[PDB]
């Protein structure tokens, strides 16, 4: 068995995007990301709790956090669950990244089907800042685009 | 143990729409539907298989059919599973429908999370015709708008 | 700079197994586990201090615990070091998983090269129960097969 | 700053064994060997590069050779590093040796933690022979038994 899902990032900004999530057996997931319309630099890219979209991206809620932890980097132990770091945006405003994460499954409890991915305006602190929002958001603050993770064929 | 979901409809037309689904215990589900920008009359309201959305609405696939059957009406035993009948537009181009189905859960195998709801341009046959697409689409055809069923707080 | 290891588990039982551990630079470690001969359900999976093996599986000492902690779950601050939670066995007695831990390096101090990986008979408590051995073992007690962590190519 | 390691030899044959290795400060290391049910006479006794063991002893690879040299006897300049020479089994087929070498450390680079000790079925040439594999395996080929060098309570 192998699973796949897609997420078409759209906002009220000139930010577009599409991200494909792949998963084998019930091991890790591969996420391929291509987003355009962003300022060159480091962003913030998380798997936000809910799939809403009714109130733009401001209803996809907080970070997906079944383990009840603090905010971190993908390579940390205290991290949310939805932390996926920063994606770098090229000089033309396109961002292409590949992250393989073992906390965003496509099956069972904790599955990330019908949740949302959000690309953030400002670079995420990885929880390293001492901001107030650091321990919760990475101060990546400003949701440019999201979309719900849905099922895609195979 | 109540579970709620949402689906914000938007196609490449001026057909908008927003749907909420609710489920208690592990029972029947209630769909509340409100869609605007539709030609007066009956249309098609189905639960299509995939959340795709990447080549518009034509990526959602066929209707959701776990039981593998023919197309029909909710009140029909032969029915697909994703088949939610027809919704009728007022003279202002609005359809406000309240559907209560037992074939579109939010939990377990057959869960409609991460999938899509599409509003068809023409009326649903219910399989009652003998068109050829009757057994498959209700000859309702032409996806005017769709949405990825995402999780919403409870 | 990337590094791999493998643990070919064998017991005085019918539990066979093989596990690999990969680590790049000086980040986290991916552990791909596959066992057979086990009984449907949850076990215990820990990195025991010694590789020993002379007096079967009982010479592996307790769980690797350099940071001196109590027993817990992988997603626990208070946790041991060698705690790797529970692996699930299917209906044919076969377990496969993919653990991404950050407490079992393959480099420098705390390196787990030459140490043992054990699969236990009972399920681990997560140190949630209040047995006596809850804070020490997770009352998983019963060493079904173990292997010493050995170097393998790349 | 003392250390100890053990390795418990077992092959797909009636050849058993346990070796311990001991190092103090960052000097020499004493190896105590005992193996049973080997055929009377000389064997080969080497430290092989990898600890593998998934395709029996044949995946342990070549002899541990960091200084990149040819094959030889413990007392030889031209020596591999893994080359521990031959051990002699008695008429009841037991073999007990105490090899003291300066080339299989247990700390730092060249460390043989996570490597394998392999007893060959034929007598090792010491590189004197002119076979063709003499400068490689010392023409002792036949991996009767082996094991991963693992840590043991100091
Ligand atoms: Cu975020
Ligand atoms: Cu349809
Ligand atoms: Cu244990
Ligand atoms: Cu050899
Ligand atoms: Zn977070
Ligand atoms: Zn249908
Ligand atoms: Zn423990
Ligand atoms: Zn050699």
From Swiss-Prot, chains A, B, C, D:
Keywords: Antioxidant, Chloroplast, Copper, Disulfide bond, Metal-binding, Oxidoreductase, Plastid, Transit peptide, Zinc. The keyword Disulfide bond applies. Its cofactor is Cu cation; Zn(2+). It is an enzyme of class 1 (oxidoreductase). Cu cation binds at residues 46, 48, 63, 120. It is found in: Plastid, Chloroplast. The keyword Chloroplast applies. Zn(2+) binds at residues 63, 71, 80, 83. Disulfide bonds join 57-146. Signal peptide: none annotated. Its EC number is 1.15.1.1. It catalyses: 2 superoxide + 2 H(+) = H2O2 + O2. One of its GO terms (cellular component) is chloroplast. GO terms for biological process: removal of superoxide radicals. GO terms for molecular function: copper ion binding; superoxide dismutase activity. Binds 1 copper ion per subunit. Belongs to the Cu-Zn superoxide dismutase family. Homotetramer. Destroys radicals which are normally produced within the cells and which are toxic to biological systems. This is Superoxide dismutase [Cu-Zn], chloroplastic.
